[PDB]
């Protein structure tokens, strides 16, 4: 199993999820069970919390490739959370048994992916961007913002998620952005 | 729409563009229209500039799902530009009306993809690492290059392409590869 | 899989390699595969490098328990390297699947063993002891040599072979 | 444009916010504000018909000197999904282990 | 690699731990942190296809200058069972007090 598109729309409306089982020929019998959306405030070390933010069972739909690829486009206003000061954990639960002879560690029934809105972080980094031009001084703000982002990236891709929330709360929980205008806009 | 792969070939002879349209149930009616290549000299903010480097029309190649996927391998030396010292901008257009159930924000006809050659940066990093191997001191130029690359990355991801051109032309223009 | 003796001959003419597979019951299926020799010039962290110094494939010698134990004696001059100023890295491989009852971490196909010539070090220690005999003062070069040897020991036992070669080339060759 | 208007509105609002908290802004910065709203007026009136694409290029490259110059003028953020190093999501699908005359072969 | 990841995570975590305890880290060491994580993303990205084994040698031998440079970066520990002088566990077993034409013999 893997993630194809894990992103928040830059208009700060939609938490885009697009998961698909891996295409190898041992992964026929493995299907998708459910999608659990969780936040930094309701996180647990192992598996989803018992108080998630949103649950979506895949099998409550057409009943096979339609299962093997799923996409959610949740409106964040419905979830009653801020698109910018919120960091989401997307758990995807599998339903089935991979055929034997697979190399071990590919038969992981659960996969987890972290989501953040980088646009306000780029807004903060653009402030210190021009320090790169000036010589004779260290671009201290630019380096600080780069290290702040890289800490969260590193702590996510290593699985050290709790320290990732600690850094996120320290740094970016006070991020501000323009809330999506609920009345839709004319453009194209 | 989106990009599948967008890079310069490892042989420094081709500029690869592979475009595909999103698989969405509301993008059946959307196809691909054209591919426009611009450099840091002709780039303009409001869409592709006039007198572009290379205009490509997709209905010439094919004789409907073929229209939804396009791949190119443009010999850069035919474009009459330096593969090392050029910053290609690749625009793509749709020529299609998505469905009425399209979520707000996804009905963007145009996209943009920036391209640079990574060999010169690689060779510069190897030179700086070789300097580091002597006396285990980091040259300040190495940190400067890293942070200038980060600045160009931030400018590109934020859409501030003119200042990215400024930084590129000022700092990284003289490149050996 | 382990080493029985990995030594350079006292005559400074042969490089002795005597490998064996462990005696525990669940390496019955496992055999010995090959012997790859690298120096301080051609080493790479990720296994043996390309263009190695000397490759050896063990089916060639024999015509199955004979294949579990191997002994080599390479004339170092035939390898076209200096026996006194060369640090050899000796890789070995298994080409065999252990049973399913193996305790975790024991199933590793590859090992490595570093080799150097102790004769020059012995001569340096004898020279420094001769210096000590005169006036009973410890030369500081002797303590430096001792501590640098201990540094290379620590680097080898921790697996930090790059800095190990750096120290070797910087101190015990030049 | 519709964005120079937003940038100018933000800039003068910040200017008068500073003049509310403080009673002083650098006139070297008021000069940049003046340049900014003069360009906003000129491009959004009857004077834009003299603008070529070279003139547009020069105008944009001159305006971006004002971008991070002060706190009032700030770097604009546009909707972009690109980067200097794009991803490779192509998949490999071999056919009947078939090498071609020289190269390998997929679907 | 999977280890440059661990070293980079450790280094930046130690950096921010120092900025939590103190309010200052030498920028001569922030330079080393920058070089380290820049190298790791260089080697775990789309630019890992341009490296030969000589380039790998040079990169490793240049990164080992950062090993004990500061407390943030440490000497990595690998699983090793070797040493500069090995033990001789071979055993001696002659055949009924025999010898060859010149020397001794065993089983």
């Amino acid at each position: 199993m893997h993630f194809n598109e894990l992103r928040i729309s830059q208009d700060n409306r939609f938490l885009i999820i697009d998961v698909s089982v891996d295409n190898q020929d041992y992964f026929e019998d493995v299907l998708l069970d459910s999608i659990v959306i969780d936040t930094q405030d309701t996180f647990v070390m192992n598996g989803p919390s018992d108080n998630p933010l949103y649950i979506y069972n895949v099998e409550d739909a057409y009943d096979t490739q339609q299962m093997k690829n799923v996409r959610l486009e949740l409106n964040i206003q419905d979830l009653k959370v801020s698109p910018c000061s919120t960091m989401f954990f997307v758990y995807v639960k599998s339903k089935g048994t991979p055929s034997t002879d697979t190399p071990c560690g590919f038969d992981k029934d659960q996969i987890l992916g972290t989501v953040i809105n980088l646009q306000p972080i780029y807004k903060q980094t653009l402030k210190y961007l021009k320090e790169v031009e000036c010589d004779c001084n260290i671009p201290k703000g630019f380096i600080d913002m780069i290290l702040k982002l890289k800490a969260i990236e590193l702590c996510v891709r290593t699985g050290n998620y709790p320290q990732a929330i600690k850094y996120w709360n320290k740094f970016f929980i006070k991020n501000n952005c323009k809330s999506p205008t609920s009345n839709c806009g004319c453009y194209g | 729409m989106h990009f599948n792969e967008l890079r310069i070939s490892q042989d420094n002879r081709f500029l690869i563009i592979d475009v595909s349209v999103d698989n969405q149930d509301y993008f059946e009616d959307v196809l691909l229209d054209s591919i426009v290549i611009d450099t840091q000299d002709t780039f303009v903010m409001n869409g592709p500039s006039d007198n572009p480097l290379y205009i490509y029309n997709v209905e010439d190649a094919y004789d409907t799902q073929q229209m939804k996927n396009v791949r190119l391998e443009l010999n850069i030396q035919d474009l009459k530009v330096s593969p090392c010292s050029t910053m290609f901008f690749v625009y793509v257009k749709s020529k299609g009306t998505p469905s009425t159930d399209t979520p707000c924000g996804f009905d963007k006809d145009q996209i943009l993809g920036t391209v640079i050659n990574l060999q010169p940066i690689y060779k510069q990093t190897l030179k700086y690492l070789k300097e580091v191997e002597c006396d285990c001191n980091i040259p300040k130029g190495f940190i400067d290059m890293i942070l200038k690359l980060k600045a160009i990355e931030l400018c590109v991801r934020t859409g501030n392409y003119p200042q990215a051109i400024k930084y590129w032309n000022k700092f990284f223009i003289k490149n050996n590869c | 899989m382990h080493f029985n003796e990995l030594r350079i001959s006292q005559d400074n003419r042969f490089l002795i390699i005597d490998v064996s597979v462990d005696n525990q019951d669940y390496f019955e299926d496992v055999l010995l595969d090959s012997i790859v020799i690298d120096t301080q010039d051609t080493f790479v962290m990720n296994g043996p490098s390309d263009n190695p110094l000397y490759i050896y494939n063990v089916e060639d010698a024999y015509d199955t328990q004979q294949m579990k134990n191997v002994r080599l004696e390479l004339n170092i001059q035939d390898l076209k390297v200096s026996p006194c100023s060369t640090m050899f890295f000796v890789y070995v491989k298994s080409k065999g699947t252990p049973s399913t009852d193996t305790p975790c971490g024991f199933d590793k196909d590859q090992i490595l063993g570093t080799v150097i010539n102790l004769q020059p070090i012995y001569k340096q220690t004898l020279k420094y002891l001769k210096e000590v005999e005169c006036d009973c003062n410890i030369p500081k070069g002797f303590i430096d040599m001792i501590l640098k040897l201990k540094a290379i020991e620590l680097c080898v036992r921790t697996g930090n072979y790059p800095q190990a070669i750096k120290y070797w080339n910087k101190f015990f060759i030049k | 444009m519709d964005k120079m208007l937003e940038i100018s509105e933000e800039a003068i609002t910040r200017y008068f916010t500073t003049l509310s908290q403080f009673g002083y802004k650098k006139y070297s910065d008021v000069d940049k504000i003046i340049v900014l709203f003069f360009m906003e007026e000129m491009l959004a009136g009857e004077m834009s018909y003299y603008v070529t694409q070279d003139d547009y290029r020069n105008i944009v490259n001159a305006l971006y000197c004002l971008a991070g110059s002060t706190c009032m003028i700030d770097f604009p953020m546009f909707e972009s999904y690109d980067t200097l190093v794009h991803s490779n999501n192509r998949t490999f699908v071999p056919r009947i282990t078939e090498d071609s005359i020289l190269r390998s072969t997929e679907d | 690699m999977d280890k440059m990841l661990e070293i980079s995570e450790e280094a930046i975590t130690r950096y921010f731990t120092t900025l939590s305890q103190f309010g200052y880290k030498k920028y001569s060491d922030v330079d080393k942190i920058i070089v380290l994580f820049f190298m790791e993303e260089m080697l775990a990205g789309e630019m890992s296809y341009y490296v030969t084994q000589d380039d790998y040698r040079n990169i490793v031998n240049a990164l080992y200058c950062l090993a004990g440079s500061t407390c943030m970066i440490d000497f990595p520990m690998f699983e090793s069972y070797d040493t500069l002088v090995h033990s001789n566990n071979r055993t001696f077993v002659p055949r009924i007090t025999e010898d060859s034409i010149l020397r001794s013999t065993e089983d």
């Binding site: 190399p103 | 490892q10 | - | 490779n88 192509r90 390998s104 072969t105 997929e106 | -």
Partner: peptide, 25 residues
């Protein structure tokens, strides 16, 4: 000598540059 999914992904991305489809004959 164990390979993870990522290593196989690198192998794919290298091999894709060398191979082409039926249409490209």
């Amino acid at each position: 000598m164990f390979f993870t999914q990522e290593d196989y992904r690198k192998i794919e991305k290298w091999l894709l540059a060398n191979s082409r489809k039926d249409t490209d004959f």
